[PDB]
Every structure is written in structure tokens, then in C-alpha cells.
Design a protein around this ligand. Structure first.
Ligand SMILES: c1cc(-c2ncc[nH]2)ccn1
Length: 167
């Protein structure tokens, strides 16, 4: 049993809910929240800006030190950093940004990072301001992630379309 409430079950391991991922994390304090990161961990807007704002910029301060030591992530890669006031840990995952011309085949690699964690609260990778088709992102999630993932879809309209169209 876990703390996640009000999710629709899509598969054995994937659950979905209409919610702002920032609002959720504060209530549940999950072991892992996933950030929709970029390779520079520059959390300016979208999921990353909203998560970072909720940490009072502490996520950005920690991220800048990480990049100064380790250099940029890979597209499709990830790192584990603090969850600050939102979660125990934040898994920063880089999905391909279609609005930068990145290979959408990298979306599966991105979701493979989730399999290193037994339970996660996450957004749909490469969705929102990353520009991918969220219906596609949900299909790759279901076909790639084997661990227990609780997805948050910010747009009520999009949430209803994701559920209604789910095979
Ligand atoms: C994009 C933005 C957000 C967000 N939460 C609060 C303000 N903006 C959440 C998910 N995707």
C-alpha cells in the first residue's frame, strides 16, 4: 500500500491523475519526484521552473553545483539529487526536446531511468513545453517503465484525452 490518492489505474504498474506535479509532491512527499530536466539543469519554466520555484530556488543552487562538478547530462539520461521540501529525492530526467530537434527515439531511453526506482511521482516526459505528443509519451511510459509510476497530467483537458484514448 502507498500514499497516492485518486489515481486511475491504467496498467499493473502505471497510474494517472489530473494534478499539478508541484502541488502533488507537497502533499505526498514521495521517495522520488521526477523533474522534466534539460541537460544543463536550468530549471526556467515548465515542470522544472515550477518544481524549482516551490523549493525557493534551492533546486537550482544544488543543480548549478552538480553541473560545475560533472558537466551536462545526456539527452535520455538522468541524475539523482535532493528532493528538498518536495520529496526525499528528485530524479532529474532529460527527455528529448522536439522544439530543439532531438531524436524522439530517445524518449524510451529517458523512461528507462525510472526502472532504477521502485515508486515514482512523475510528469509525462517530453510533454508540456518539451513539445512531444503526450499520447505518445504515455504509450512509451507504459511500454518501458516496469516500476510503479504515478503520473500527473497538468491539463484537465489533456488528462481526459489521455484516459479516453488509452489502449
Ligand atoms: C508545467 C507547469 C506546471 C506549473 N505548476 C505550477 C505552475 N506551473 C506544472 C506542470 N507543467
Amino acid at each position: 500500500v502507498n500514499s497516492f490518492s485518486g489515481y486511475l489505474k491504467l496498467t499493473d504498474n502505471v497510474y494517472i491523475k489530473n494534478a499539478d506535479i508541484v502541488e502533488e509532491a507537497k502533499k505526498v512527499k514521495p521517495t522520488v519526484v521526477v523533474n522534466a530536466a534539460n541537460v544543463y539543469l536550468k530549471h526556467g519554466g515548465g515542470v522544472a521552473g515550477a518544481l524549482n520555484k516551490a523549493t525557493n530556488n534551492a533546486m537550482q543552487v544544488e543543480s548549478d553545483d552538480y553541473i560545475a562538478t560533472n558537466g551536462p547530462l545526456k539527452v535520455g539520461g538522468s541524475c539523482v539529487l535532493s528532493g528538498h521540501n518536495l520529496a526525499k529525492h528528485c530524479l532529474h530526467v532529460v527527455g528529448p526536446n522536439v522544439n530543439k530537434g532531438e531524436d524522439i527515439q530517445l524518449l524510451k531511453s529517458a523512461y528507462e531511468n525510472f526502472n532504477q526506482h521502485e515508486v515514482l511521482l512523475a510528469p509525462l516526459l517530453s510533454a508540456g513545453i518539451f513539445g512531444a505528443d503526450p499520447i505518445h509519451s504515455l504509450r512509451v511510459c507504459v511500454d518501458t517503465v516496469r516500476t510503479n509510476v504515478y503520473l500527473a497530467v497538468f491539463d484537465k483537458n489533456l488528462y481526459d484525452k489521455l484516459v479516453s484514448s488509452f489502449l
